[PDB]
Design a protein that fits this description.
The structure is a monomer. The chain is an alpha+beta fold and about 210 residues long. It has one domain: Alpha-Beta Complex (Phosphoenolpyruvate Carboxykinase, domain 3). The chain contains four helices and nine strands. The chain binds ligand IWR and zinc ion (ZN). It is classed as transferase/transferase inhibitor. The entry lists the keywords protein-ligand complex, diphtheria toxin like fold, ADP-ribosylation, TRANSFERASE-TRANSFERASE INHIBITOR complex. It forms a monomeric assembly.
Amino acid sequence: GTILIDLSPDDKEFQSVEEEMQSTVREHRDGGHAGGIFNRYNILKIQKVCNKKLWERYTHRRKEVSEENHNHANERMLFHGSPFVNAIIHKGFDERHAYIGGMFGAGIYFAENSSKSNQYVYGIGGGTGCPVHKDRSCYICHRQLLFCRVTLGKSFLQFSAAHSPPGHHSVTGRPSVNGLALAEYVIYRGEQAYPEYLITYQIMRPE
Ligand SMILES: O=C(Nc1cccc2cccnc12)c1ccc(N2C(=O)[C@@H]3[C@H](C2=O)[C@@H]2C=C[C@H]3C2)cc1
Ligand SMILES: [Zn+2]
């Protein structure tokens, strides 16, 4: 059911999406170990993901959440990185494929910092890096992230160094030590996120 619509670099949508990618890069405490050393990306392609069934299941869940939260879905646009992006855009997010550990357990993770989601493209801690060079800082190989519409509803606040807690619809991971880090978010039900944009990019070696 999925079609991918290529956006042109002068489309206003391409530009606002690229600006959110670029402007949310930060430095990471691993000094670039997991995601590579970079201050900006080379954006190669932004595609709009169109799937009617996945959209209808997103908006249906969104209305349920909203009606339980004084008419407030608390919808955000957030990045998601994982090795399974190409499965996700065809079949939707699935909590059954969620990995057992991590800071917030077996959920589907999103991030406000595109650089945080970039650390997961090749797996946890960056896995072995790119398939071709095994370089977690590869400046050559094309990477992909999703920029996703996510329904958070009443989110449980976790001050920070499976299912949502009872009475909540997601978890907000709130950075409590690092001054520059933005929030991460976790949902436990695949239907509460729609992957709107597939972004293809390279990290760039700083001059
Ligand atoms: O929906 C996901 N994957 C998939 C959806 C639909 C079909 C799939 C088929 C095969 C594999 N994954 C699929 C998915 C769920 C959770 C994660 N996920 C996270 O969000 C966190 C963890 C994870 O597995 C660790 C990797 C990224 C962070 C850290 C990744 C992908
Ligand atoms: Zn490579």
